[PDB]
Design a protein around this ligand. Structure first.
Ligand SMILES: Cc1ccc([C@H](O)P(=O)(O)O)cc1
Length: 300
């Protein structure tokens, strides 16, 4: 069956704890062996959205678990659109998107994790981090001079930023995700992997669209110029912060419809392990319902 092939491919996208990461050689940004048509996919995507809505409903009705979903990617990989599409099928009462832009003055007066801890999802809720605490081992690692401006970093000279500084930050991130995992939070992390070539194409496509080129950030080019620096940061990060408890998935991003299918797919598959069920109606409650129905019928 097609889905059976998909479940098999999906597992190759999970980053294993001991796994070493080369984003250049491995992790195709576009899956050629695509096992279903773009049509099939948009229909399996619809099912994934409906199922996720069902899961979210059952999650909200129970008071047990929260769900944290992290999205990281290079500009133009499809992150905002994946978030928007995940959302279309969710109830806004039980889901919350936080887009972590550049930190505020207050947030800079706290450790780099503080503002993400503040924004964690409550029991029964889904939290989506569009950008996340991982920015602090990515953009900060490509631009290590930012750490000098961060009062809590304890970094005075760029000389002291080395692999051991990042190792300690991975440890801090891992202890943080482990703690919340041990206290009811399901953590799922997606890196949307777009090719340097496809980013180029999408950048140019936007520049040439009058309806949308007002949105183009030419500063995105400065980060594109640091492509190799970012791949290294992502590689070292994926190799050191994917656990079985809080796994990373590397999603091919060059085909948006397929990116969305996979992420919807993985979220459903992972949250189905919770074996969530709608609340059942006891005999006492069934009696109360029939009493209420009787009164409504017995109205003058
Ligand atoms: C060219 C271009 C398209 C879409 C976007 C979105 O903001 P994302 O795919 O980075 O979330 C950014 C740049």
């Amino acid at each position: 069956t097609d889905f059976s092939k998909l479940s098999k491919y999906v597992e190759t996208l999970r980053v294993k704890p001991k796994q070493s990461i080369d984003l250049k050689k491995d992790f195709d940004t576009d899956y050629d062996h695509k096992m279903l048509t773009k049509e099939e996919g948009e229909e399996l995507l619809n099912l994934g959205i409906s199922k996720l809505s069902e899961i979210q409903e059952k999650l909200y009705a129970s008071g047990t678990k929260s769900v944290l979903i992290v999205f990281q990617a290079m500009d133009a990989a499809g992150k905002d659109g994946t978030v928007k599409h995940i959302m279309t099928g969710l109830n806004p009462q039980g889901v919350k998107v936080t887009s972590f832009k550049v930190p505020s003055k207050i947030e800079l007066s706290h450790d780099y994790l503080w503002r993400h801890y503040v924004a964690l999802p409550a029991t029964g809720e889904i939290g989506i981090f569009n950008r996340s605490h991982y920015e602090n081992v990515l953009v900060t690692r490509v631009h290590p001079e930012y750490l000098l401006s961060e009062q809590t970093s304890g970094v005075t000279a760029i000389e002291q930023v080395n692999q051991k500084f990042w190792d300690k930050r991975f440890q801090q991130i891992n202890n943080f995700e482990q703690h919340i995992s041990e206290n009811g939070t399901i953590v799922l992390k997606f890196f949307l992997h777009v090719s340097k070539k496809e980013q180029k194409k999408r950048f140019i496509e936007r520049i040439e669209l009058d309806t949308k080129n007002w949105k183009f950030s030419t500063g995105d080019l400065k980060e594109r110029a640091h492509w190799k620096d970012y791949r290294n940061a992502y590689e070292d990060m994926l190799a050191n912060t994917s656990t079985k408890q809080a796994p990373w998935f590397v999603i091919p991003a060059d085909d948006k419809w397929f990116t969305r299918l996979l992420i919807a797919e993985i979220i459903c598959t992972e949250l189905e392990k919770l074996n969530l069920t709608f609340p059942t109606v006891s005999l006492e409650q069934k009696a109360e319902l029939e009493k209420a129905k009787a009164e409504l019928v017995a109205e003058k």
